[PDB]
């Protein structure tokens, strides 16, 4: 019918969760610096 | 000496069957430690009371040791030697050469045996990556080197059947299963080479007597060269499933048959050339070499990335060919009262915090923040003991009568659905508790039960896998309940073990023919990633086979 | 319909491609970031130093506990750690602070792991071979070591400490 509405909400809640993961450990790992 | 027709002109289903049937059998077995390791993390030691039950249990690290071993690697083993030998060959309806299939069913039967009994018996607490000086029973390694061997009796029964396909359909593409299966057991062949050679140069010598010294840093190099692949190698079957049956359980269609092949073509290359995320503590090797292998692991999650939308996409229109409403109405359209469609819908959920967990610790610096911690246990048992493992779950509903005949009445499919949710959700608690406590240092591999006050700051994670400990107890429990009430009823229709498996359509393009067309040039890519191995290791092993420190062995248990 | 679906899935497939790699490239590009600032002296050293460890604590830099420490600059100091079957030598390690502790950690039996608890100290401890490290702590106190490497039965209970001086 028409865009994956639907997958590329998936996809943006995987694309946020990799970026909370990665931005919130990149954090962790200077404070430990 | 044949009781069913049906395994004399499909004997495969047989062989099939007892790979499946050993490898659940491993499962529970290695599931039951579970629950007391999950309590362990929750400051909570049930140990004198798994003790008094099973009394020849002689430690945490014993218990852990079986957990390991007998849930990601004979279970995991078992599992693919199955459905990527089975499904190939009903796709392409051949028979897989009967005499060697049967041979790598008692290879991995004898193997198993000759290891448990060291195991069983507390000469091998070593845990499942068994590094030296560790020194195990002779018998453990010898039986998990056959083990693993009868897969190279996999590889060559699945190229076997690929070549004959060949011969018979002339300038034709390979079917997609079989793509799958092919580019997968050649992978796997590659990758298995460097725990061959630790095999072969260094533990079956050591432990025979021959030697006495064993290179650690060398020994836990070449270990994880098969060390990462090996994953791909329990999900790759889960992929399997999941691309060319789950969206016929759904009630739609595979949206892509390049993009599939693509999928697999990237893991045939990029699986083997990344072990060195997983030695990111070491020392003796080379900053640079590591982050190239923060790179190449970086670009092996792209695969992933691409099933993640191509999975979804498939289950959105399943999901709108069932009525779909909006942005969220095909979620409620698909089938969640089926278990071969419930089972691995969830472990992909729980695969997203799986897969994100996984690029961080692949991030080369941002490895010491979690190295060895409580969070990769976390990490993994939202990728191997969920995604994987309800995939083998489910896939039980449709495997199950196809192999056996026997029906699943509607109390077991129910059940079933119990089991499913309740096994996801203490994954998911248990996920939560393990990075937690990961990220405030609580160590891994470690029995922190018996040093209770050591760390006091775990204090609610703490709860949480105290929690997923009892959940995931009663899942397990009413899986073997289950399981053995579909496999000891005698309830049997003989015409559903003859129904065809149940494979999903794949829509086509224009376009596709090109690309799929360059991406059946197999012996070329077979190359292209043996070359890839010999550049990403070849500079650094060499420089550490010139330079070897060979130290003597420890028992510690 | 299927057919006008597969363009756009096979489209969307495409920018959502373009975009991952742009994203992992952006990740590529902080790591490499993180490797020429201070952070980056907890990467373990490339070259091979091989010991023998049958012969660790009875000669040569690890066989004094009293000697461990060693000023090697004007604010470096190299501490010759032993981590063996349960326990860390020496025990406190005593370092001052806003100085370049060098550690330089091996083994006498088996592989442990070395990690000192907030810090981005985490090392794999191998016999027969010296993990070296780099690390300026800014914090002043405490530093608990912890063996995150299945090492024994006393595995669990494998702490050591660092002393690090205000
Ligand atoms: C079978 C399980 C395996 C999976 C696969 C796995 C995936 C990865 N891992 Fe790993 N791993 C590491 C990096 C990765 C990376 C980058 C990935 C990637 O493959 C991840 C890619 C995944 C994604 C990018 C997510 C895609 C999401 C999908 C596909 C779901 C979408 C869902 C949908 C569409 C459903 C929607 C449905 C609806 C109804 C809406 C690293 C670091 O570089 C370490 C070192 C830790 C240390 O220091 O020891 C590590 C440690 C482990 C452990 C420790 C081994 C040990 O004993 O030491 C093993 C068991 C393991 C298993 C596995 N690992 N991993
Ligand atoms: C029955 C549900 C399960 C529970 C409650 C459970 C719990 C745990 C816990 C708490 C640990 C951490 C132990 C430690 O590091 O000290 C662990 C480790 C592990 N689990 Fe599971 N697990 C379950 C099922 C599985 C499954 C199905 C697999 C694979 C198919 C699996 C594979 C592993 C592996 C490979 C380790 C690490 C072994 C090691 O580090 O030596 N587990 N499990
Ligand atoms: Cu040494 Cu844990
Ligand atoms: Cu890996
Ligand atoms: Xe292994
Ligand atoms: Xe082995
Ligand atoms: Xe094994
Ligand atoms: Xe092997
Ligand atoms: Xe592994």
């Known amino acids: ?33 | 000496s044949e009781i069913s027709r049906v395994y004399e002109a499909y004997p495969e289903k047989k062989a099939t069957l007892y790979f499946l049937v050993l490898g659940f059998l491993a499962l529970i077995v290695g599931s039951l430690f579970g629950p007391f390791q999950a309590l362990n993390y929750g400051n909570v030691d049930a140990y004198p009371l798994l003790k008094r039950l099973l009394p020849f249990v002689q430690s945490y690290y014993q218990g852990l040791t079986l957990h390991g071993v007998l849930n990601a690697i004979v279970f995991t083993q078992l599992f693919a030697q199955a459905i990527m030998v089975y499904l190939p060959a009903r796709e392409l309806n051949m028979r897989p050469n009967m005499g060697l299939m049967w041979l790598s069913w008692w290879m991995a039967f004898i193997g198993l045996v000759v290891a448990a009994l060291p195991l069983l018996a507390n000469e091998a607490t070593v845990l499942y990556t068994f590094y030296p000086p560790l020194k195990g029973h002779w018998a453990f390694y010898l039986g998990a080197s056959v083990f693993v061997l009868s897969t190279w009796v996999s590889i060559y029964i699945v190229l076997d059947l690929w070549r004959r396909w060949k011969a018979a359909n002339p300038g034709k593409v390979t079917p997609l299963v079989t793509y799958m299966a092919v580019v997968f057991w050649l992978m796997w062949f590659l990758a298995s080479l460097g725990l061959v050679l630790e095999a072969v140069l260094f533990l079956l010598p050591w432990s025979f007597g021959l030697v006495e010294g064993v290179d650690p840093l060398v020994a836990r190099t070449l270990f994880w060269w098969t060390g990462h692949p090996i994953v791909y190698f329990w999900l790759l079957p889960a992929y399997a499933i999941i691309y060319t049956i789950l969206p016929k359980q759904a009630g739609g269609k595979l949206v892509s048959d390049p993009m599939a092949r693509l999928a697999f073509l990237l893991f045939l290359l990029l699986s083997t050339p990344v072990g060195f995320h997983h030695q990111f503590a070491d020392p003796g090797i080379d900053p640079t070499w590591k982050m190239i292998h923060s790179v190449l692991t970086l670009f092996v999650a792209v695969p992933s990335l691409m099933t993640a939308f191509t999975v979804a996409a498939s289950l959105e229109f399943a999901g709108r060919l069932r009525g779909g409403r909006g942005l969220f109405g095909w979620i409620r359209a698909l089938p969640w009262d089926n278990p071969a469609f419930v089972a691995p819908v969830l472990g992909l959920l729980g695969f997203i915090p799986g897969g994100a967990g996984g690029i961080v610790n692949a991030s080369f610096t941002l490895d010491y923040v979690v190295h060895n911690t409580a969070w990769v246990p976390g990490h993994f048992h939202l990728q191997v003991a969920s995604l994987v493992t309800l995939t083998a779950m489910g896939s039980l509903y449709w495997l199950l009568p196809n192999l056996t005949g026997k029906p699943i009445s509607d109390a077991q499919r129910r059940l079933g659905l119990a089991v499913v949710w309740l096994w996801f959700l203490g994954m998911m608690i248990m996920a939560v508790g393990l990075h937690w406590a990961g990220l405030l240092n609580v160590p891994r591999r470690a029995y922190i039960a018996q040093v209770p006050d050591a760390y006091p700051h775990a204090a609610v994670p703490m709860v949480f896998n105290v929690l997923a400990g009892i959940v995931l107890l009663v899942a397990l429990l009413l899986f073997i309940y289950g399981l053995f009430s579909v496999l000891l009823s005698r309830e049997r229709k003989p015409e559903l073990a003859e129904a065809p498996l149940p494979f999903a359509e794949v829509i086509s393009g224009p376009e596709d023919r090109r690309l799929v067309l360059a991406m059946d040039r197999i012996g070329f890519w077979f190359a292209v990633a043996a070359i890839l191995v010999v550049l990403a290791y070849g500079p650094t092993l060499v420089q550490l086979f010139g330079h070897l420190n060979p130290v003597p062995g420890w028992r510690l248990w | 319909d299927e057919h006008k679906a597969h363009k756009a899935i096979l489209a969307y497939e495409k920018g959502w491609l373009a975009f991952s790699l742009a994203m992992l490239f952006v990740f590529i590009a902080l790591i490499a970031y993180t490797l020429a600032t201070h952070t980056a002296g907890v990467i373990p050293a490339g070259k091979l130093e091989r010991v023998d460890p049958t012969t660790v604590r009875q000669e040569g830099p690890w066989a004094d506990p009293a000697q461990a420490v060693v000023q090697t600059g004007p604010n470096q100091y190299t501490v010759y750690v032993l981590a063996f079957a349960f326990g860390y030598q020496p025990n406190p390690i005593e370092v001052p602070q806003g100085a370049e502790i060098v550690f330089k950690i091996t083994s006498p039996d088996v592989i442990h792991g070395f990690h000192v608890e907030g810090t981005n100290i985490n090392v794999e401890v191998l016999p027969g071979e010296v993990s070296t490290v780099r690390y300026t702590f800014k914090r002043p106190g405490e530093y608990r070591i912890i063996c995150n490497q299945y090492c024994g039965l006393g595995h669990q209970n494998m702490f050591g400490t660092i002393v690090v001086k205000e």
Not at chain 1, 19 to 32: D, M, Q, T
């Open chain 1, 1 to 33: 019918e028409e865009k994956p509405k639907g997958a590329l909400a998936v996809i943006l809640v995987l694309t946020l969760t990799i970026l909370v993961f990665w931005l919130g450990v990149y954090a962790v790992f200077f404070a430990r610096g």
